[PDB]
């Protein structure tokens, strides 16, 4: 056996974006849990779908300008 990850329990494939849940510290493919790689810089706290129930929804944090 080898290290496996995510809800799909697969070995690490370097061609796939992955994100680590801040609550359980496990790794998930963005495509398996609905997170796109381009969205990750805006995530302040990521909770996977399981951990959302015990720890609450993920939090986004980003900068914004409004007048222009």
């Amino acid at each position: 056996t080898v290290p496996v990850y995510c809800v799909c329990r697969l070995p690490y494939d370097v061609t796939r974006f992955m994100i680590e849940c801040d609550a359980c510290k496990d790794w998930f493919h963005g495509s398996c849990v609905g997170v796109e790689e381009e969205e990750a810089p805006d995530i302040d706290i990521y909770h996977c779908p399981n951990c959302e129930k015990t720890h609450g929804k993920s939090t986004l944090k980003k900068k914004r300008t409004w007048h222009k």
């Binding site: 690490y12 370097v14 061609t15 796939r16 974006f17 992955m18 994100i19 680590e20 849940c21 801040d22 790794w27 790689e37 990750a40 995530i43 706290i45 990521y46």
Partner: peptide, 8 residues
């Protein structure tokens, strides 16, 4: 969060 970027 920690991430692993998609590679080629």
């Amino acid at each position: 969060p920690r991430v692993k970027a998609a590679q080629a």
